[PDB]
Design a protein around this ligand. Structure first.
Ligand SMILES: Nc1ncnc2c1ncn2[C@@H]1O[C@H](COP(=O)(O)OP(=O)(O)OP(=O)(O)O)[C@@H](O)[C@H]1O
Ligand SMILES: Nc1ncnc2c1ncn2[C@@H]1O[C@H](COP(=O)(O)OP(=O)(O)O)[C@@H](O)[C@H]1O
Ligand SMILES: Nc1ncnc2c1ncn2[C@@H]1O[C@H](COP(=O)(O)OP(=O)(O)O)[C@@H](O)[C@H]1O
Ligand SMILES: [Mg+2]
Lengths: 192, 1154, 67
């Protein structure tokens, strides 16, 4: 029996898979990291515009970033979480290690700055908003709250441009080329 | 007497080897008690061998033994493996070294020789009255142990080695604790430098720095501590000038560390808020210390970005500390990130960026020596797994440099082993199972790889292996910081502006030069510039003249023609601005060697000498026959004259020998290492039994093309590692007097990983003039032999005014197998000198005018057959006309000759041929025509001149015919016939000579006969095929035979000498299908003769002679011989014209058909 | 528009766990592009199925005999 393994194309599908594969701040940071991993892996598919090359981010990078997040939350018991330290380490050491260019380091740093800003109200995508944890919730309650936030999200048809914060010209070019290739292949497949 | 001396020397060498082997056997089994009971059959075999050796020794005092000992070495493999298991650091030693160290039951001085192999930073052990006082580092630092180790007579190597290993760690910790306590007392570090070892001072200073910086970070003040660190740096800089060499190295390394401290404090001071300062302090490496641990060696831990690592307290010595750049700190951070989860650290990027050095510096900061391996194609799964089980038992940090060089199958296969090591470290497994044997796993071990992707001939790591390594990009280093800090440490008053000028100059030189592939101006050339500027301060001073001279001496020789002008213009724009003894020695060496010291040759010799003065590996690149070998030989001769140190040279051709013959090859049937050639030379130099190589310079010249597959196995040899890492685990150091030369003609296929490691000398034009080359060749030919009167005649006749125009006219001719006229002079000079020496017998009975005319005729003939010997008949006629017009002198025509001294022609030299009927089928029959006798005579004249002959022409032209016809009428030469194919090796040539030659040790490959020489006739020399890098094994082997007169024997790595064997080659035009162009470095040594097709009239005459011979059988039809032959010749011509190769590939016609 | 056909007609999709569970074959083949490896999915599936994987990379005679 033959199975071809490849990364999930959708962004929300990737977030759902990374969330379902798993104090309350650890749950919050894991949710943010799953969102960041999904966004960066979706951005990697746009070769000339999303990055300057073809980079591959896998589960090892997510594991290392999650271990670093748990280590930061464990060693800082004062609840003054160093979001700048997390941003710099994730964009430079964990996810930015393989990044050979400079503009791609800049865009990884910008993605980390948008996701790991550590604000009370975080608009990670134009539709969904992730409120920060309170001081009396439980781990199971936090997991239920975050999966309820994730479930209500509806992915728009322009998620490759609206969610990744990119101009629509290159997105339209890439989608048009892919649609043309698939439609031509199935047209010459259907004629005989 | 010479043969007797050689036999005595060989017997002495064999006896020394047998005595060493028996001493090792007596040490391991013949003397120690309670060691004979492990293997009783091997015990009895060793007893029998010892009895035989004792009987032989008694017979000598009043071969087969070595064979029996070598047979029982395979029985000792399990014993040696168990001995390596007992002390895990024995995995870095060879089997012979293991025998030497086990057999030293009471000597206890052979272990101090292998300290450097086992430990990496300890060169000897200080003994005192059968006890150990301390160890001595490679740099010369002395570490005194806490307590003297008491040694007995029954004690063996492993237990006292283990307690010495623990005592080294305890002594390092004790010195660190004392230094840290004394620094806590409040004293300055300048008095503490002269007391303890460098590692203790470094660790104590780091702990104090991080404690004080955290104290200053509790508040928001940094100016006072920054000023204090600045005064400390100034104090160390003042103390640098008034200290010994060891204290100089110690103060320099402390200066590196204190400059890093000052940089970090200054960066923390400029932070606007507290959060930026906290993030910056979390990013940099911090050296804390536990205050509650009852274990001493685990009391110091290292923190960076939250993760914690343990200091090992292993002896480091005084290494060349690296300048702390931001890229270095980010690399340390990602290495700590990878090692927190027991993963493998990984660095990728272009060559010369600081990857292996970064891994080594991380190990040094973590207090352990990183054992670096240079991966290669020969590293199979078993060899790599053996290295892994070597480094897991030790606990050492193994760095696998050039991890791309491994085969893809090996990379896939060792993935399970690497994952097993990582999982065992993560889960705390005591024993891991590798290679079907359960081995202990030390918790201190780690694996690092530094691959260099994007180059030709390198594999790609599979993703199931890449997921076990945390890779980091090292594309762009910070050369400005490195240059500024190094210049500041060396004592230059202006460091910032000077370093900025150096980096700007290197950038502008990289941007404003021609796009040649060997122009790399990265970090390695900056390091070379600084390492050259360091000695120059004695005669130039710490300023700008020193760096200008260093830049010239490092960069100028590797530049082209216009790039030198660009270099001069840029050096004038940016920077503002005796050697009599060496030049006199060079001129004396050239006079004794016969060369002419022009401006170009002297400039190249000066460049070579000045670049080798600080660089250990060199590359000499230029056109074929431009003067590379002459350059380095003359410089080495001048070196021996000027310094008094004797020079030994080993000229090795890289591509002639396979890699298994060059470096070595483990025998899979018995897991025994077999030394190659370069490895054997290096081991002989390192061992130094006779004391000869103690004060001599050793040169190893690789006189072949730079194959990446062959040279990148010496990557660790070329760079600062200076270690030859063998597959079996042996780490052969490179002595400072051991230098490597690379002689090549092009750098098309070599990688930047090789060009950057070696100083490069570029030969833009030939180093000799045309007339100077002619004069040197004449002098060599005279020395190879009245004599004073004849010498003036040939030299005066070689008038350069006509000769230069003759060469210019010869440049316009069409030459098959294109060779420059600068390279064809050897044939002309040697042929003319041979002809003069041959006709010297009848030169005493003729006048001066006759002598001048005969000499002029012979020189004109030699010039014709050298310059235009590889051209068609019409071209040869045009050239003989123009050499007649460009020289009163005797006229040479197309058939002019000298008979026994009178001038005649070939028309009177034709002998009458009346073939019998039955003599047609004899293959040795040749019908003499004008062209046949002319080619035969010139071939015999060239072959008597001790020169190689390459016969070129279409198939069926008569090259083999002229060969056999010239060599049949002589009793001085035998002919051997070798037909080369698409797949021909050196072994076929050696097999064709096994029944025709003798190996005599006077080694020498003399011919089997005693009076007749041997002629190696190689047919179809174009046919042997190129490899994937464009080189022919057989062609370079024949070039080695022609030029160096010998070859290296593969199995016993010994040099033979070819004495009475000549080489004649036969080849087709390169434009023919299936033929490839040979290298000009081979064709330079062989005289070329073009043998064309016979004319139609000549073919008709030859075959009407054949038809008359046939029709002698049928006498009534003797009047039809001419029509039959003309019909056959017309038929052959029409078949050749009509059916061409364009129709079918096998439509080849020749006179062989007729 | 491309995914509209999948979202309209076919109301089921199969992941690796569904293929492994809903197949009678005891032999499976996994393919992927270069620099993408999916052995972690198989390890996770084996952990979820309470079985044990024996990871044997191929390429050497020792690994072939072990396999
Ligand atoms: N200064 C000189 N004076 C006289 N002869 C010289 C001088 N320099 C070089 N030659 C001659 O140049 C010839 C070719 O030079 P050389 O032997 O150094 O070649 P090479 O660089 O080793 O080339 P190849 O790649 O063919 O081996 C030699 O026969 C040597 O005699
Ligand atoms: N602070 C530093 N960081 C990196 N490299 C340095 C530093 N200081 C000097 N160097 C020089 O840079 C060179 C780097 O070589 P390296 O990159 O280790 O070779 P490879 O590419 O084979 O690993 C070394 O020769 C070293 O002398
Ligand atoms: N006197 C002669 N002059 C010129 N060619 C001859 C003479 N006698 C024979 N030949 C022809 O020359 C051919 C020799 O070719 P050969 O040397 O074997 O080819 P190759 O040069 O490829 O080895 C013979 O087949 C013969 O027909
Ligand atoms: Mg390296």
């Amino acid at each position: 029996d033959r199975v071809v393994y490849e990364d999930i194309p959708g962004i929300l599908d990737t977030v759902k898979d990374l969330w379902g594969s798993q104090g309350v701040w650890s749950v919050y940071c894991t949710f943010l990291l799953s969102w960041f991993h999904a966004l960066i892996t979706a951005r990697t598919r746009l070769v000339p515009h999303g990055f300057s090359k073809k980079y591959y981010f896998n589960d090892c990078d997510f594991q290392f970033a999650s271990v670093y997040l748990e280590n930061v939350l464990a060693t800082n018991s004062t609840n003054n979480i160093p979001w700048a330290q997390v941003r710099d380490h994730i964009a430079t050491i964990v996810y930015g290690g393989k990044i050979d260019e400079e503009k791609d380091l800049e865009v990884v740093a910008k993605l980390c700055a948008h996701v790991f800003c550590g604000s009370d109200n975080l608009q990670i995508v134009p539709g969904v908003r992730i409120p920060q944890p309170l001081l009396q919730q439980s781990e199971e309650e936090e997991r239920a709250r975050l999966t309820a936030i994730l479930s209500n999200t509806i992915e728009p048809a322009d998620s490759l441009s609206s969610w990744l914060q990119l101009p629509r010209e290159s997105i339209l070019d890439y989608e048009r080329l892919q649609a043309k290739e698939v439609a031509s292949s199935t047209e010459q497949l259907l004629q005989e | 007497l010479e043969s007797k001396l050689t036999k005595l020397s060989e017997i002495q060498v064999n006896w020394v080897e047998v005595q060493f082997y028996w001493l090792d056997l007596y040490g391991i089994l013949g003397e120690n008690l309670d060691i004979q009971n492990f293997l009783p059959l091997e015990t009895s075999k060793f007893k029998s061998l010892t009895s035989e050796y004792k009987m032989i020794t008694t017979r000598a005092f009043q071969k087969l033994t070595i064979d029996s000992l070598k047979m029982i070495k395979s029985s000792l493999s399990t014993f040696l493996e168990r001995q390596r298991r007992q002390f895990p650091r024995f995995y870095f030693l060879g089997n012979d070294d293991l025998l030497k160290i086990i057999g030293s039951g009471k000597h206890h001085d052979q272990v101090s020789k292998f300290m450097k192999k086992m430990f990496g930073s300890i060169e000897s052990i200080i003994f005192f009255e059968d006890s150990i006082t301390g160890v001595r580092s490679v740099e010369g630092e002395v570490l005194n142990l806490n307590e003297k180790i008491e040694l007995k007579d029954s004690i063996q190597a492993q237990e006292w080695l283990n307690i010495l290993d623990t005592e080294i760690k305890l002594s390092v910790f004790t010195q660190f604790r004392d230094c840290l306590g004394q620094l806590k007392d409040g004293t300055d570090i300048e008095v503490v430098v002269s007391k303890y070892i460098f590692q203790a001072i470094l660790l104590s200073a780091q702990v104090m720095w991080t404690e004080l910086v955290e104290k200053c970070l509790q508040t928001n003040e940094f100016s006072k501590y920054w000023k204090e660190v600045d005064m400390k740096i100034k104090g160390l800089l003042d103390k640098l000038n008034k200290s010994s060499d060891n204290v100089k190295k110690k103060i320099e390394a402390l200066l590196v560390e204190y400059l890093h401290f000052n940089n970090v404090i200054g960066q923390l001071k400029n932070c606007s808020t507290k959060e930026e300062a906290r993030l910056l302090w979390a990013k940099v490496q911090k050296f804390y210390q536990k205050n509650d641990t009852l274990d001493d060696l685990n009391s110091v831990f290292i923190s960076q970005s939250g993760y914690l690592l343990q200091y090992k307290f292993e002896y480091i010595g005084i290494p060349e500390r690296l300048i702390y750049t931001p890229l270095l700190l980010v690399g340390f951070a990602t290495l700590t990130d990878s090692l927190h989860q027991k993963y493998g650290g990984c660095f990728f990027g272009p060559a010369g960026t600081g990857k292996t050095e970064t891994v080594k510096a991380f190990g040094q900061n973590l207090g352990r020596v990183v054992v670096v391996f240079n991966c290669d194609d020969s590293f199979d799964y078993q060899v790599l797994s053996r290295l892994l089980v070597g480094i897991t038992q030790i606990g050492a940090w193994g760095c696998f440099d050039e991890f791309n060089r491994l085969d893809e199958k090996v990379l896939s296969a060792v993935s399970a082993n690497i994952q097993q090591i990582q999982n065992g470290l993560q889960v705390g497994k005591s024993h891991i199972t590798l290679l079907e044997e359960e081995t202990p796993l030390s918790p201190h071990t780690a694996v690092f790889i530094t691959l260099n992707p994007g180059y030709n001939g390198r594999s790609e790591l599979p993703e199931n292996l890449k997921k076990s390594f945390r890779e980091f990009s090292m594309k762009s280093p910070q050369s400005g910081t490195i240059a500024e800090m190094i210049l500041q440490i060396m004592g230059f008053e202006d460091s910032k502006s000077l370093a900025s000028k150096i980096v700007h100059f290197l950038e502008l030189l990289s941007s404003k030069c021609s796009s040649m592939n060997h122009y790399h101006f990265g970090l390695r050339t900056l390091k070379g510039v600084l390492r050259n500027c360091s000695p120059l301060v004695s005669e130039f001073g710490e300023g700008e003249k020193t760096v200008v001279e260093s830049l010239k001496r490092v960069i100028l020789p590797s530049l082209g023609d216009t790039d030198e002008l660009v270099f001069k213009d840029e050096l004038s724009k940016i920077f503002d601005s005796n050697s009599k003894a060496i030049v006199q020695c060079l001129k004396d060496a050239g006079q004794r060697s016969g060369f002419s010291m022009s401006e170009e040759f002297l400039k190249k010799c000066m460049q070579f000498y000045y670049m080798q003065k600080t660089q250990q590996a060199l590359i000499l690149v230029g056109k074929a026959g431009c003067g590379k070998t002459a350059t380095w030989k003359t410089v080495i001769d001048a070196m021996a004259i000027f310094d008094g140190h004797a020079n030994v040279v080993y000229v090795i051709d890289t591509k002639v020998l396979t890699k298994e013959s060059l470096y070595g090859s483990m025998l899979k049937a018995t897991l025994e290492w077999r030394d190659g050639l370069f490895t054997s030379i290096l081991r002989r130099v390192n061992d130094d039994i006779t004391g000869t190589f103690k004060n001599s310079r050793i040169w190893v010249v690789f006189d072949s093309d730079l194959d990446p597959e062959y040279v990148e196995a010496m990557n660790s040899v070329l760079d600062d590692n200076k270690i030859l890492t063998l597959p079996n685990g042996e780490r052969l150091p490179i002595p400072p007097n051991f230098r490597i030369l690379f002689e090549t003609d092009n750098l098309d296929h070599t990688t930047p990983a090789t060009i950057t490691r070696c100083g490069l000398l570029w030969f833009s034009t030939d180093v000799c003039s045309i007339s100077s080359k002619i004069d040197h060749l004449l002098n060599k030919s005279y020395e190879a032999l009245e004599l004073d009167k004849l010498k003036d005649l040939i030299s005066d006749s070689f008038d350069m005014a006509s000769l230069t125009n003759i060469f210019t006219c010869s440049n316009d001719l069409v030459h098959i197998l294109g060779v420059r006229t600068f390279n064809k002079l050897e044939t002309a000079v040697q042929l003319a000198v041979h002809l003069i020496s041959s006709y010297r017998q009848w030169f005493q009975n003729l006048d001066d005018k006759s002598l001048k005319d005969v000499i002029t005729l012979l020189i004109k003939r030699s010039l014709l057959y050298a310059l235009a010997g590889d051209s068609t008949g019409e071209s040869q006629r045009a050239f003989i006309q123009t050499i007649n017009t460009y020289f009163d002198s005797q006229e040479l025509s197309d058939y002019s000759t000298i008979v026994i001294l009178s001038f005649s022609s070939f028309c009177s030299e034709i002998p009458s041929v009346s073939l019998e009927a039955h003599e047609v089928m004899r293959p040795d029959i040749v019908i003499p025509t004008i062209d046949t006798i002319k080619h035969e005579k010139i071939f015999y004249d060239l072959l008597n001149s001790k020169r190689g002959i390459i016969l070129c022409g279409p198939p069926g032209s008569g090259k083999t015919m002229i060969m056999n016809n010239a060599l049949r009428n002589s009793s001085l030469y035998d002919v051997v016939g070798i037909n080369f194919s698409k797949d021909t090796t050196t072994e076929h040539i050696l097999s064709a000579l096994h029944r025709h030659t003798n190996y005599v040790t006077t080694l020498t490959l003399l011919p089997k006969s005693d009076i007749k020489n041997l002629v190696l006739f190689c047919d179809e020399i174009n046919l042997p095929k190129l490899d994937k890098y464009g080189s022919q094994n057989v062609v370079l082997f024949l070039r080695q035979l022609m030029e160096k007169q010998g070859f290296w024997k593969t199995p016993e790595n010994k040099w033979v000498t070819i004495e009475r064997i000549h080489i004649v080659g036969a080849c087709n035009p390169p434009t023919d299908p299936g033929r490839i162009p040979m290298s000009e470095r081979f064709t330079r040594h062989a005289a070329i003769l073009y043998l064309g097709y016979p004319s139609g009239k000549s073919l008709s005459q030859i075959y009407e002679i054949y038809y008359k011979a046939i029709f002698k059988l049928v006498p009534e039809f003797r009047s039809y011989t001419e029509p039959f032959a003309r019909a056959s010749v017309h038929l052959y011509n029409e078949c050749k014209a009509r059916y061409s190769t364009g129709l079918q590939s096998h439509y080849l016609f020749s006179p062989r058909e007729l | 528009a491309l995914n509209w056909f999948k979202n309209e007609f076919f109301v089921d999709e199969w992941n690796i766990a569904d293929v492994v569970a809903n197949s009678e074959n005891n032999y499976f083949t996994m393919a992927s592009e270069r620099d993408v490896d999916g052995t972690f999915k198989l390890i996770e599936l084996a952990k979820a199925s309470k079985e044990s994987l024996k990871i044997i990379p191929l390429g050497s005679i020792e690994n072939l005999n072990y396999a």
